[PDB]
Amino acid sequence: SGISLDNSYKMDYPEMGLCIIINNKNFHKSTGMTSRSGTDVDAANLRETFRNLKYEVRNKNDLTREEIVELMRDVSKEDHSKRSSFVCVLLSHGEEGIIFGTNGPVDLKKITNFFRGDRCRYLTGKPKLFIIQACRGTELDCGIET
Template sequence: MSRKSKKNAHDTVDASGDLGGQGYSSSTGNAEDSSRGSVPVVTLEELESDKYNMNHPYRGIAIIINNQYFDEHLKLSNRSGTEVDGLALYAVFQEMGFSVAVHENQTVTEMVEILQNASKEDEYHSHSDCFMCAILSHGKEGTVYGTDGAVELENLLKYFKGNACPGLVGKPKIFFIQACQGDNFDKGVSMNVVDAKGFMPNENITKIPTQADVLIAYSSVPGYYCWRNSRNGSWFIQALTEVLQKSWKKCDLLTILTRVNRKVAFDFKSETSNPSINDMKQIPMFTSMLTKQVCFTPKE
C-alpha cells in the first residue's frame, strides 16, 4: 500500500543533522499579559453546546507560513516540494471559507510579527468561527525554523491564548506543524493480516483556561523525522489536504485528523537510494485542548 514516488522525486526529512545536509537559539516575542478590551460575550446556548458555533459571518483567518530556503550558516537543505504543500493548503483552506494569507521564506522575526499581528485582529475575530495556521519548515522537538534561525513553537502560539487574543476566546485555534520533531527514524513493524475466518487475503461570563480551545497537529511524534517528497510534497500535508477536501463538510476535525494519521501510517513509506533510510514509516500526532467538536458547517 505504499504511495509511489514519481520519477526523479526523492523523499527527505524536515530536521537537523547530517542526513540531508541540515544542521540547527530561540527567538522570543512577548504576548500580551492580559486581555485587550472588554470581556467577550457568548450566549448560554453557545456555551452549553457540544459543538463550536460555526455560523458567524466569517470562517476566519488562515495563515500559511512556508519556508523553503534558509541562510547558509544554518546548513539546512532547501525544502523542495514544499511549494506543492503550500498550494494544496491554500486551495482547501479557501474552499472551507477561510481568508487565506500565504507568507513564504520568513525570518524568525517576521514569523513572530505575522502571528502577533494576526492575534490583534479582534474585530474580525469577534465575527469569525475560528483561526487556522499552518507552519511548514525544518524543525526539531518544540522548535521550528525561520530562514535565519530557530524559534520555539510556544513563542509563536502564545499570541492566541485567551488572555492575549480576546476575539478568539471560546473559539477553536487550529495549528498544523509540518516539521520534524527529532532525528529518529520509524522503521515500522510487520504484521500479518487475516480475514474474519482467519485466512490471509491479498494485500454567560464564565472562566475558561487560557490554554483552552487550541489544537496542534504535528507531522510526526516527538523525537522523529518526518518525510517530504521533492515532487509530491510532504506526506502529512498530502494526507491532510486530501482528507480535508473529502471530509470537511461532513466530519468533525478529530475524525478528520484520525483519518490523516491512518493515511500517513498505511499509505506511505520512504523510497530512497540510501538503503539505511529506505522503507521507513511515519505517524503524525495531534494535541487537543478543544472543549467541543469542530464541525465546519459550509458557508452560504
C-alpha cells in the same frame, strides 16, 4: 425554544477565520539548512483546500524568525469578532518544540502564546488550530509488518 445542546463549536460566524500558511522553502546559507523541495506543492494544496472551506487564506513565504513572530503578533491583534476560528500552518525545518525561520529557530510556544485565551480575547472560546509539518527530532520509525 426546545431543548438545546452545546457540544460543538459555533462555526456560523460571518467568517470562518484566517488561515495563515507559513511556507519556508529557502534558508539562509549560514544556518546550514537544506532547501525544502516539494513544500510549494504543500502550500498550494493547503491554500486550495482551506479556500474551499471558506477560510481567508494568507500565504507567506520564506519568513525570518523575526518576521514569523511579528506576523503572529500582528495577526493575533486583528479584530476576530466576526470569525469562527483561527488556523495557522507551519511548513519548515524543526526540532521538538521548535520551527525554523529562514535565519534560525522559533519556539512553538512563542508563536502559540499570542493566541492564549487571555491574550487574544476575540478568539477566546474559539478553536485555534496549529498544523505543523516539521521534524520533532531525529528518530526514525522502522515500522512493523502486519
